[PDB]
Enzyme design. Structure first.
Site, PDB file in Angstrom:
ATOM      1  N   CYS A  75      20.181  -5.606 -71.840  1.00 14.92           N
ATOM      2  CA  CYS A  75      19.764  -3.564 -71.981  1.00 14.92           C
ATOM      3  C   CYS A  75      20.899  -3.471 -72.823  1.00 14.92           C
ATOM      4  O   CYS A  75      20.224  -2.099 -73.538  1.00 14.92           O
ATOM      5  CB  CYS A  75      18.261  -3.483 -71.404  1.00 14.92           C
ATOM      6  SG  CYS A  75      19.796  -2.583 -69.627  1.00 14.92           S
ATOM      7  N   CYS A 157      18.986  -0.006 -73.083  1.00 16.99           N
ATOM      8  CA  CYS A 157      19.269   1.376 -72.211  1.00 16.99           C
ATOM      9  C   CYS A 157      21.264   1.506 -71.872  1.00 16.99           C
ATOM     10  O   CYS A 157      21.254   0.823 -72.572  1.00 16.99           O
ATOM     11  CB  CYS A 157      19.335   0.272 -70.060  1.00 16.99           C
ATOM     12  SG  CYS A 157      20.802  -0.969 -69.652  1.00 16.99           S
TER      13      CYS A 157
END
Ligand SMILES: NC(=O)c1ccc[n+]([C@@H]2O[C@H](COP(=O)(O)OP(=O)(O)OC[C@H]3O[C@@H](n4cnc5c(=O)[nH]c(N)nc54)[C@H](O)[C@@H]3O)[C@@H](O)[C@H]2O)c1
EC number: 3.2.2.-
Length: 252
Positions: A75, A157
């Site tokens: 991520c 992320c």
């Protein structure tokens, strides 16, 4: 024939064979995707647009394909891009420093390809496909990319990076897939920072393009989402690639 139905290029020649060979290649190379049966991937891809009006495609049509192509991507290592696909890919090619969407199975299957079908007929249309501007936006290609680009943004992320083409009229374009879809689907609970790399096409020296009006717009949109914004100029894309291949020693 002298007059086609749609105003855009027709399905890429050998589209079935090409998607299937790409699926073979990808699944052989990437160990995490060894469980993928490529015929059923092809079948799900086919089931999304075949026999369907190529101006009436939905995200739901691609749900069987999204499921079979489910894939975990690190991520914090995501690279978005806009109008600068070649550098983005040459970059991630060097040592998998990061991933673009086209490094995922789904993105890899469809990259540089066009496809459409016909209502009430199971034929692939090799003669023409809807242009997203001239014809209709809910077409097989446009719908596919919108759906996967969005899911790819949602998976990010930490620090997310985006390469932008510093020689465009609008370095950040709200009407691009990056600007209209991806920036709005980054998850503020997860994404700490969006860092833009502005790639100079301009010879030698050149301006601080992180000060460009469109970059300030991007900054402003991203900040109002509670995500931090960072920007860096890449003055010489040639030297950048070289420094990635060979860090230090060279005047990097
Ligand atoms: N690999 C791809 O072709 C692709 C297509 C669309 C979107 N992506 C993903 O969104 C970002 C790039 O899209 P975007 O910001 O629109 O950059 P570009 O304008 O360079 O898009 C590439 C192509 O996508 C075509 N294309 C096809 N349909 C559309 C559309 O409805 N809206 C729109 N803005 N572009 C569309 C367009 O004609 C270009 O030929 C990047 O993070 C990729 O991971 C990738």
């Amino acid at each position: 024939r002298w007059r086609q139905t749609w105003s855009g290029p027709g399905t890429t020649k050998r589209f079935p064979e090409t998607v299937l060979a790409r699926c073979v290649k990808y699944t052989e190379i990437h160990p995490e995707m060894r469980h993928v049966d490529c015929q059923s991937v092809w079948d799900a891809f086919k089931g999304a647009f075949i026999s369907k009006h190529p101006c009436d495609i939905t995200e739901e049509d691609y749900q069987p394909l999204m499921k079979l192509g489910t894939q975990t991507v690190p991520c914090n290592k995501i690279l978005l891009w806009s109008r600068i696909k070649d550098l983005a890919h040459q970059f991630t090619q060097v040592q998998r420093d990061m991933f673009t969407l086209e490094d995922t199975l789904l993105g890899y299957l469809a990259d540089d390809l066009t496809w459409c079908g016909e209502f009430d007929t199971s034929k692939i249309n090799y003669q023409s496909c809807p242009d997203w501007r001239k014809d209709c936006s809910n077409n097989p290609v446009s719908v596919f990319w919108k759906t996967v680009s969005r899911r790819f943004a949602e998976a990010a992320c930490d620090v997310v990076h985006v390469m932008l083409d510093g020689s465009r009229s609008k370095i950040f374009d709200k009407d691009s897939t990056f600007g209209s879809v991806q920036v709005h689907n980054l998850q503020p609970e997860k994404v700490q920072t969006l860092e833009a790399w502005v790639i100079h096409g301009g010879r030698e020296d050149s301006r601080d393009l992180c000060q460009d009006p469109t970059i300030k717009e991007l900054e402003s949109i991203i900040s109002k989402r509670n995500i931090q914004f960072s920007c860096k100029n890449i003055y010489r894309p040639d030297k950048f690639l070289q420094c990635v291949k060979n860090p230090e020693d060279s005047s990097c």
